[PDB]
């Protein structure tokens, strides 16, 4: 029995998952309105998303007191957070590729080996989402000087959402999110004592992340890239069958 804290969540970032089992959360599918010329690139990007979705489930599973939740609720929390947690990780990685400290940012870190260029997003018609990710999230967190402790705490608050529809034990999810609110306020008060609006400033990025996440689904569903009928089952099988994370000493 361990305590849900920022210190434990920081240790969980070092753990790397073995994605030996792959689940097709995002796939091109038949009769795709994606032009065939760009169909192979979109499929590649979907397989990259699926890998990061799989590593996201392994991370959520080892969060303290997350396994003690009902398996129905564990599926619902990951089902309603994977898109927002993906964009939040993309924005966190994209902070390094920012221009300077009047041209808009041009690079976005899909993955450590990936940068999606702004012109490619404009051709795909997702340039508006592209810029919001880099401005409302990446650039704002650089201005807010967000460290990894606050970043991993916001990740837990995004996942542990008691307002998820269909939960069996809502109040069990509340206690975990309420504990993360206490951990976040304590870190903001001892580190940056002068900044008294930082606790709200960090949390004000979550509504911005939601609006961006919902807009991504509109493009994802318009191109029939999501298999929503099978996502709930993939998380169930990933929570049970995926191997424990590898550790870096």
């Amino acid at each position: 029995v361990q305590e849900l804290s920022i210190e434990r969540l920081l240790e969980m970032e070092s753990l790397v998952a073995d994605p030996s089992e792959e689940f097709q959360f995002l796939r091109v599918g038949p009769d795709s309105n994606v032009p065939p010329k760009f169909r192979a690139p979109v499929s590649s990007l979907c397989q990259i998303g699926n890998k990061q979705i799989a590593a996201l489930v392994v991370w959520a599973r080892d969060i303290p007191h997350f396994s003690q939740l009902e398996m129905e609720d564990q599926i619902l929390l990951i089902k309603g957070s994977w898109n927002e947690l993906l964009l939040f990780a993309i924005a966190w990685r994209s902070m390094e590729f920012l221009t300077e400290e009047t041209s808009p940012p041009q690079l976005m870190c899909l993955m450590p080996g990936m940068t999606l260029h702004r012109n490619s997003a404009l051709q795909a018609g997702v340039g508006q989402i592209f810029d919001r990710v880099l401005s409302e999230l990446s650039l704002k967190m650089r201005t807010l000087r967000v460290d990894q402790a606050e970043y991993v705490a916001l990740k837990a608050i995004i996942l542990l959402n008691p307002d998820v529809k269909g939960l069996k034990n809502r109040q069990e999810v509340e206690v975990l999110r309420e504990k993360m609110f206490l951990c976040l306020d304590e870190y903001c008060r001892r580190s940056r004592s002068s900044e008294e609006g930082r606790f709200a400033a960090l949390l004000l990025r979550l509504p911005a992340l939601r609006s961006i996440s919902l807009k991504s689904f509109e493009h994802l569903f318009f191109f029939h890239l999501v298999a929503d009928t099978s996502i709930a089952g993939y998380i169930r099988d990933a929570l049970r069958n995926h191997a424990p994370p590898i550790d870096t000493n």
Binding site: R132, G197, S211
Partner: protein, 240 residues
């Protein structure tokens, strides 16, 4: 002990609760005017007519809000367009009756399960009722609710000319809510929890505001007549 509320913050709280109570209920004179503009189409009319009236009350509340005059006219319309649907979700959720598990709007004829099922939007009311039950469990007083409403209006929206200015105005209401929760709870550790759960509503009303935009587009595709004031305030495209 606990940092107290300043004279500016105590007056702002008293001002917000004062005017939000005046716009809780629509005016009887404006009640009959919006109906004279335009198979029964009665459930769809009552829901839209009450939405027009309540949105009009939201704009009047937002225009008389401290800081709304400091921003440009183009930024005023941008904030009014975005917060209209989301504040509507707070107005309706504020009138949730736990005993009957429904929305009691005194009129009690628009926001009902029966009118939404007859208007074809049977799936929508259950998503609204879930947000009503979730927000009802928070037990916000009129101060939490009024300060939250102002925080919604001065939120960072896409297409703002002066985002740094609106952010300073929003922070002026956030700190009022923060100190109010501190004095209310005697600086107990739970002050951040109550302050955090209120800020969590900002995230959830983004989804409901997005569902309203998708519903307005679906109604425009099915050739169902949406009122003109609601089509302009939310930028509903005349789509085929």
């Amino acid at each position: 002990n606990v940092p107290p509320l300043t004279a500016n913050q105590k007056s702002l709280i008293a001002r917000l609760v004062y005017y939000q109570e005046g716009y809780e209920q629509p005016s009887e004179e404006d009640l009959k005017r919006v109906t004279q503009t335009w198979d029964s189409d009665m459930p769809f009319r009552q829901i839209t007519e009450m939405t027009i009236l309540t949105v009009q009350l939201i704009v009047e509340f937002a225009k008389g809000l401290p800081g709304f005059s400091k921003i440009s006219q183009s930024d005023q319309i941008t904030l009014l367009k975005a917060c209209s649907s989301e504040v509507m979700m707070l107005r309706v959720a504020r009138r949730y009756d736990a005993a009957t598990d429904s929305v009691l709007f005194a009129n009690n004829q628009a926001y009902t399960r029966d009118n939404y099922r007859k208007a074809g939007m049977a799936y929508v009311i259950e998503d609204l009722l879930h947000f009503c039950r979730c927000m009802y469990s928070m037990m916000m007083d009129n101060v939490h609710y009024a300060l939250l409403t102002a925080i919604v209006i001065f939120s960072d929206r896409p297409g703002l000319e002066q985002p740094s200015l609106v952010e300073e105005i929003q922070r002026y209401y956030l700190n009022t809510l923060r100190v109010y929760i501190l004095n209310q709870n005697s600086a107990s550790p739970r002050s951040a929890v109550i302050f955090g759960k209120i800020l969590g509503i900002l995230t959830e009303i983004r989804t409901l505001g997005m569902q309203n935009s998708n519903m307005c587009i679906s109604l425009k595709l099915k050739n169902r007549k949406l009122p003109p004031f609601l089509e302009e305030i939310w930028d509903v495209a005349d789509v085929a």
